[PDB]
Design a protein around this ligand. Sequence first.
Ligand SMILES: [Mg+2]
Ligand SMILES: [Zn+2]
Ligand SMILES: [Zn+2]
Ligand SMILES: [Zn+2]
Lengths: 103, 95, 184, 1250
Amino acid sequence: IGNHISALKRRYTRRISLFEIAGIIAESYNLLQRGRLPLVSEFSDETMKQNMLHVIIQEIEEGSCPIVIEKNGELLSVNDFDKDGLKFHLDYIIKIWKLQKRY
Amino acid sequence: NTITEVLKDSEEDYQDVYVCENCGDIAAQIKGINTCLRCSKLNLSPLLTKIDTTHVSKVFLTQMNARGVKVKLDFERRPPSFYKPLDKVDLKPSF
Amino acid sequence: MNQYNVKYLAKILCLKTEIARDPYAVINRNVLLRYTTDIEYNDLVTLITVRHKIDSMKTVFQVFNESSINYTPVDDDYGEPIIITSYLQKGHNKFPVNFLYIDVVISDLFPSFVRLDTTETNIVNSVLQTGDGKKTLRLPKMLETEIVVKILYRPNIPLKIVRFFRNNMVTGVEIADRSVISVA
Amino acid sequence: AVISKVTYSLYDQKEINATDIIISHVKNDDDIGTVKDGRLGAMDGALCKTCGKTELECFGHWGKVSIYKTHIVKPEFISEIIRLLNHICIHCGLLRSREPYSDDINLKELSGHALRRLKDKILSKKKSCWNSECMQPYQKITFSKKKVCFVNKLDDINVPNSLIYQKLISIHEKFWPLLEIHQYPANLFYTDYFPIPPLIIRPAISFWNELTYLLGMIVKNCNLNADEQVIQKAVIEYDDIKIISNNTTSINLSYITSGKNNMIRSYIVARRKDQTARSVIGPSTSITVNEVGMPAYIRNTLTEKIFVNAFTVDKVKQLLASNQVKFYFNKRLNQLTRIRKNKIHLLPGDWVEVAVQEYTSIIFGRQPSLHRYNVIASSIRATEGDTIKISPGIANSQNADFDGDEEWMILEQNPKAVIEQSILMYPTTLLKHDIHGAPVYGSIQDEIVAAYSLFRIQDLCLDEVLNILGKYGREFDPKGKCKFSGKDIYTYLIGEKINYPGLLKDGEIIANDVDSNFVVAMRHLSLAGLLSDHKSNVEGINFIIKSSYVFKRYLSIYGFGVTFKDLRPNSTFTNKLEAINVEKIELIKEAYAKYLNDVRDGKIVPLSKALEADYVESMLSNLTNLNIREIEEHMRQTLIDDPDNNLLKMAKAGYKVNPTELMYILGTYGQQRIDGEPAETRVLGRVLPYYLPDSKDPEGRGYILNSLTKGLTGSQYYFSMLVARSQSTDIVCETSRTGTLARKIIKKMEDMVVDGYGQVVIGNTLIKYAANYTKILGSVCKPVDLIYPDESMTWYLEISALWNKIKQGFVYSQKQKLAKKTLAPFNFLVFVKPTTEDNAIKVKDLYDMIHNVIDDVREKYFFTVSNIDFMEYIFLTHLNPSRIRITKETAITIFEKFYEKLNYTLGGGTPIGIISAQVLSEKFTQQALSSFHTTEKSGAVKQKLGFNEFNNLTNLSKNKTEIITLVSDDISKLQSVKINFEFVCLGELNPNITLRKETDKYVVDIIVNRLYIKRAEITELVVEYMIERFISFSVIVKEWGMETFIEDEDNIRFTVYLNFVEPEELNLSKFMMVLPGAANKGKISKFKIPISDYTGYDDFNQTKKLNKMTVELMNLKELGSFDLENVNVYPGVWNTYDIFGIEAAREYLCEAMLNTYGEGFDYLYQPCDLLASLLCASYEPESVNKFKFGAASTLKRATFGDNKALLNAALHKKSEPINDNSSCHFFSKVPNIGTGYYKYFIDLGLLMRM
RNA sequence: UGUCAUUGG
DNA sequence: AGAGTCCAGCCAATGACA
DNA sequence: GGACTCT
Ligand SMILES: [Mg+2]
Ligand SMILES: [Zn+2]
Ligand SMILES: [Zn+2]
Ligand SMILES: [Zn+2]
């Protein structure tokens, strides 16, 4: 039954909130701002003609975001969380970034 | 991260400062070699770790050393961790 | 021990009788609706007869002062003398005189508590595990010299976690746990 | 690279002597070997001789000065040495008992309190030393603050430090667990050398050092022919002058850890910053709540960072070609260059700094930062003037007016900080309040009346509607209508077909009027709150922006102004109320004079002064209520005569006009209260010389008959100014106390966060199993109506079973209150649509859905350790088919939203402790500065309300009396305690005491009145027993004899015959002086014990009449002699802990801290519980002033304020990990709060794969 | 570089 | 039972003075 | 001025 509680808590670990996605976006944005290579598909010079937040969000939904977050003793990628939670928070973040005229 | 970058010293005011892991004070560069004077007088050769702290933190630690309180910092030699793939988890309810 | 502070002890000994017939029962003042006391008061030994209402089971407690203890087992006895001590002492049958200044079981400040069984203790211990390695959270603490630990006592079941059912103005009942730590 | 833990210790002599820099000279022709040495660090204008580095790269080096044959004591551990001297003899070195030294004890293996059994035995024997060659008496050596040596106090002799040194190094190592020693005690002294600190803590002061001068006064005594006392005094006044003196302002070492202005509190958790600004604020209508207007001088001075990378290298090259770049930072050479043509090569990692552009997030705020809505981060817009133009919609969030308030700005252009400012501190993210969920932004004064009059408007054209709508009239749909109303404008403004009980139905407002509860910030009926409960905070922020635009366009078209003619159009009503007041107050004066003359001629017995004051208080309160009713009838008659009165319009809209303020203007000003009572009588029994001596005029005690329209007279202006200046003095005296308690609570609660499993923890202790009782954010959680079980409900059996499970806690406040609201996990009422019974979901299928969802949630989200039967009760009573039918897709929508709120809203790292602490602190600060809690006096002793009661609760002081409440169904058990405990003396019975001398006896007649005995609620035998007890136990009475005569049914004569102890005349006068007071009974207190009664709840449907009683009482011991069976007893906090335990103490602290805020603040229950569960997290209640049982680090205790924290950590050799905010800010670490709650790695696999 | 006086939110 | 010790909101702005 | 602690 302790194994069942451990399984329930491992399933609870996959919840994503605004703090985790804001930290993941901030880490990847700080690394890309100082000169790390953008890990997107269709790597060209045209990808350096768009802004960097589009590159960060494209890295997130393409499954190639390099940032690994350590939560509850586990190591999670941004695609190991709940997909609906990632979509729910990224829709809000893209809305408020479009209000800020930065996306 | 915002309150960390606010409360810490500016990124323009950065310099490589080394601390002694045994006695806790700032290492010195004699003629290019990072040494600890207190441990080279005591016939040691301990680890010197690069630290990024504020200048007021070092002034506070040196003044507490002047009062007699030795402050010694320990550092994390973390075991190297490896990312492994995880199973699919869907948190949507079942109706 | 006087003629007033033995009725409050009788209300305590209903809860001790309920624990003696079921160690995993929920103890509050509603337990007092299932029992009936009879007090024979004397300045050497006070006999308190607690009777279960539906099962007609009787339990006779012999209440003494801390100085003069003349204990021989009567029939239907609890098995151990109840001693009213002057100060808070370590022991499930040793109630200090401050516990019996007022009527404590009928009060609104009297808690509602259980001893957890092995299933609930394992669930609590696996919930407290932080997931990272062998690290664990701690429950808040409670001293062993407390009236809850004295009521919940069983001779070969060690009491480590007590679950409290707190009153909550917005949700009704809230679940908390305390860990019982040692004294002397 | 990552600092884990910090170890504090003491320097031993081999580390002090480990130096090649010997300081020897005081003054010199060349400073070599002096204290201002060039190898002790680089000074101003010289390289360091040890390292070759300049002042900004040399961190300084240590020196040593030789003390020749002296043992200099370390000055702050002196007390510890004093403690170590109360354990040993000084002629020998042995301990004060034989049991440490015997071969039967084996000191390495005993655990627990067995080590502490022996030590008070060591501190009990102080007669003489026990060994055969030392039987000297145990001395009590004290440090003499007068002259600097250690001094014996049996006889004043200086004990030298070389003997305390020998006797403290004589103690063996395996007796250190006894005497609390963790290192060599020779580390408590400087035995052969003294360390000279580096120059970096004492730089060259330049304006046109103190520690350098103190070290020079040390080295001026460091000679071989020099006493250890003068060197000890120099060392002490260099380190800590307050050891031997009582003067401040000396710059010593302790100056960095002295009080509020110490180093950590001033320069580590707070600092002065670059890229900052400060300016006066003004409003702006072209600025939304998401924006801020920046003046031109700020954006012409402040700079923003553009990093060099593959994305922005063309923009940086373009800005360098056009001379728009102000600074350039080269990261690889690590240097900044100001551009005033040079050569600059742009590598990735470098940056440039240009002028700050629009839509950059600035962090701006107002001071004092009482709660987190003071400091937000919004987008820069270019505006005019020199003022920072904020929106008015954020103004109530920051407690801001535009009457001269200043606000500050800071620009933090770090990319992690840029992302956190863009997401977490954006005002759209902070729309809902984090405790009670109401919107933080909204409308203010004029827009409230604009909202009211816009709802009330009728019969508009399409062009008038489009003129009101303005730029939002683009997508307005006229369906087929040609005439419109303001309800159609509101239906367009809301734009959602949502329902809410009492407010909305299919988007239309079904309320009668739109008032301030609809549009003002932090209200429970906000339409923006419902629109953001429906979809998201973007929809609520859009409704707030669009609503403010439309209300200001209504004000532009139609206008709003209040004239003098709306208040006082003529003299008719004010003349009528003036005549009414001058009739009724003369009626009051004649009735009071008739009572006074009936007392004076003797036709009735007089009342007590408290009851007389209560009777006059009731008559004047009746006159005040008559004025209130006249004002209300005038308001009704004016709005039915002139229905367009603007003053009554802003009264009906809900802004600041009520009948009491209109009574102050047009009616009467009332009775002026100071400390709950009228103004006290001074010299000659009066307040002012405008009244006769001992004047019974109630107008001369502070009752004002005039109003502001008539104008106050001189005495009335005195009493009004007395109340005003008293309020000003009280808020000035209370501001600093509220700030101190706010800082204490914030530092205690700030490390309490929500962990990754939804639990509330601090350190490694679980405080709560579920955050906010729901594991959902508190801004999402909705206080919904609690519906008691009725037998007309569908599944009355299941609903009544759940109510029997959770019905405790819904009857609270000593059974006086029944709960009317509970906590729905989210606002599901906006998703409920009514439906006819043919299209509705089936009834059993709805129960199966509710039961299956609640069981699945209880398993998967709460881990089967939390009781969430309140959620099932809410979903069973609010979705009950007996009152509402819903479709199947409505239920699916509701429970999918339930799972969305359980899955996405609450996250680990949420700073729930500091948010709750800031909300509690902001509320008691607002109530203290607003004078919200009026003092009022009553007969019984009551629990106080307000900040001083909250501070007494969090102080947890022990040796104080507590208010102990006794509730009983029968009044006999309360009467038996009330008779014995209530203080009644003979003098308060108003006796007639006269004595006369007689041969053999002095006889004293005490003629008491029987109505006075009945007013005291005692009998004549009680008075006889009081006098008999005092005379039979007194020392000054030698013989006595008492008799009781009957004089009337109005008089009882207690006759005493007496002979006093010689000297009998002085004892006669002392007896006659102390007789009316000392003949008494009961516990002495200023409060009486009246037996109250009320209606208490057993449940929602069954009540009972209960009798109440309150006693000020220290212990609970003296209650133990009474028949207190079937009596509820509610003591204070320490008696509840000592009887019932730690959980009942936690519960008492919760409800008592909640009760100090007053009526209408139930949302502060969840913060207060979070505070109480912190004070009762150990086995004992712990205050907010100290750290006793909670594991707090040394930097946490030093940041909290504890000057000997690092010294006690160095004595006990503490090694503590760095996990708290105060320890993370010291070492420049990211705190474990929010986004810093998680560790972040980078997976270099996909980069190395290609 | 700190005190004192006055003032602001 | 009585003295010692430490504590008393935040952020400002001018001028005079040592 | 006022609360906690040692004496
Ligand atoms: Mg203002
Ligand atoms: Zn070293
Ligand atoms: Zn140097
Ligand atoms: Zn001796």
